Design a protein around this ligand. Structure first.
Ligand SMILES: O=c1cnn([C@@H]2O[C@H](COP(=O)(O)O)[C@@H](O)[C@H]2O)c(=O)[nH]1
Ligand SMILES: O=c1cnn([C@@H]2O[C@H](COP(=O)(O)O)[C@@H](O)[C@H]2O)c(=O)[nH]1
Lengths: 317, 317
């Protein structure tokens, strides 16, 4: 993955991570405008998926000459969920270092949305774009092995997010199969208003909780020999957490940071990118979800963020 | 749920929570012995599900006169996964205050296992036995709303587990829809060997992290008015965490504790139940998974735990 991200970086010249978190309004509204416009976006998905992608879950109906009928409410919902996702990808992939799919959004409909999630990850695997499953997964080792099978065997994700409140020994079961190695990003500092209550107010020997968490995480990453095997344990540090992103880059010059919170949550892209800067700029993934997926034009949204990042990285070079 | 658990308690006279975490060996081995024995357990599932349960996901094939053929590898796997789960339930439900299903185990096979999970929760809803989804879910409010829809709308779970490293404001989006209220158990102290590294070594003003987490959690539970609305925020406290379970019961006399770690993980049932005792004994859910699901006789395993708990509660009365 370290090589995969470096190669991708040099190809798209950005650290923009597109967040794909489709909610019911997004899907319903996309269906609505596709019905009205004669399925323009669907037709683009069918031609522009190059060699062309064949969805494994309901591939025939998704690739069909005519969409499902409205009487088939479930099928219709599945059809437009998949094509909404495919559309966001095709519109934005030229500007994307990675995509991060938040698991929560693919669950409210039962198995239906997991088949969609499978199709999304498979398509991105087909395109070879770096992938993140945002799951903030955590449990005891034996249970975590089963999360690993879902994330890394079934979805074939490049990485996921993980919550290490339980301890770092958990990393041994998510990041290794002895022979296969996988990357994860651990929650360090989060974007929500009250994140300071445990992440900053708790401490050990003068060091804030988030620092203790980062330090113990890298101690374990080294014990696991991930980096010798092309993989890493990175850090989720909120785009509005300017002090913490600075601190984390200071203490761990070569770490990989995943930074959500720009756009919908009003994080200061320039302030955060300056604070968390690495010349190896795939080491700050700036995640933007709703500011792209809910915009009038996701392509232009993506392009705008691509340009702003380009401009800030020029300032910093 | 407080009333539901009290009523269930008086009916089964225990605080035993059965863990249903089926791994691939469990399913394969159950299929194997059902093929050999002429599908005895399946036949019991079909007669003893009372009025009889009709699975919503693949109900016809599950209720069928003859199982799927071996050529249909996926269908066959789904069939024996569901019937393994149904079998553990029918064998143990007389001894169970609740069942806790760990989400991880229903994921490695994609949508297939989520349909199974749906069938399990629906059957338990049909039987009206209290349910817990063990997911240790955590994210920002907007994302958490979608986890709530899965857990509480789709699965119709009575409760779930939650990880509040991010903060307690998250509880507002998992425990409330303003008008509907739901129960959750937050991770306080976990069973893994290295759980002390953050849960005990981090502190604020003399108080260990796990205590700060419990205190802030109940502050929020009160702000949310859950208990006036029949619901609660409980605590996950490991069965091997004797000191912490004592401390938590001391500080919060009326809290609900979910205590895994007895059986496979060798937690001291008597030591933990004594330390965490409430006369309202649904307030210590003693979870036992593998010690029941991997035993030669889950019915007898369950019965043994039921008796030990009965005996310890007599000591304590
Ligand atoms: O501290 C964090 C950690 N994770 N996320 C996740 O990153 C995404 C942000 O999306 P947005 O750009 O639509 O706000 C969502 O998937 C959210 O769950 C955050 O927003 N903040
Ligand atoms: O501190 C914790 C928290 N959760 N669990 C969960 O409780 C169950 C224990 O199952 P067992 O009885 O098979 O060990 C599993 O679902 C596991 O993920 C623990 O074991 N320990």
């Amino acid at each position: 993955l370290k090589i995969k991200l470096q190669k991708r970086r040099d190809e798209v010249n950005t650290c923009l991570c597109i967040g794909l978190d489709p909610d019911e309004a997004d899907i319903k509204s996309f269906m609505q405008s596709e019905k009205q416009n004669g399925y323009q976006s669907v037709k683009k998905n069918l031609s522009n998926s190059g060699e062309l992608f064949a969805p494994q879950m309901g591939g025939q109906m998704l690739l069909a000459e005519t969409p499902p009928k409205e009487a088939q409410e479930k099928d219709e919902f599945f059809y437009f969920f998949n094509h909404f996702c495919f559309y966001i990808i095709n519109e934005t992939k030229e500007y994307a270092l990675a995509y991060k799919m938040n698991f929560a959004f693919y669950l409210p409909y039962g198995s239906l949305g997991v088949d969609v999630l499978k199709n999304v990850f498979d398509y991105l695997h087909h395109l070879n774009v770096p992938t993140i499953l945002d799951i903030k997964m955590n449990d005891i080792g034996n249970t975590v092995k089963h999360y690993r099978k879902f994330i890394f065997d079934y979805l074939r994700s490049d990485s996921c997010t993980a919550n290490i409140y339980m301890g770092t020994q958990m990393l041994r079961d998510i990041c290794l199969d002895c022979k296969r190695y996988y990357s994860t990003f651990v929650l360090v500092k989060t974007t929500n208003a009250d994140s300071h209550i445990f992440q900053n107010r708790l401490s050990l020997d003068g060091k804030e909780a988030y620092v203790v968490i980062a330090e113990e995480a890298q101690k374990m990453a080294k014990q696991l020999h991930l980096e010798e095997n092309g993989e890493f344990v990175g850090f989720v540090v909120g785009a509005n957490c300017y002090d913490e992103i600075k601190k984390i880059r200071e203490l761990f010059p070569d770490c990989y940071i995943l930074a959500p919170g720009v756009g919908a949550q009003k994080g200061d892209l320039r302030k955060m990118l300056c604070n968390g800067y690495s010349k190896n700029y795939e080491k700050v993934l700036i995640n933007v979800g709703r500011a792209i997926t809910k915009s009038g034009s996701p392509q232009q949204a993506a392009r705008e963020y691509h340009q702003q990042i380009k401009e800030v990285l020029a300032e910093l070079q």
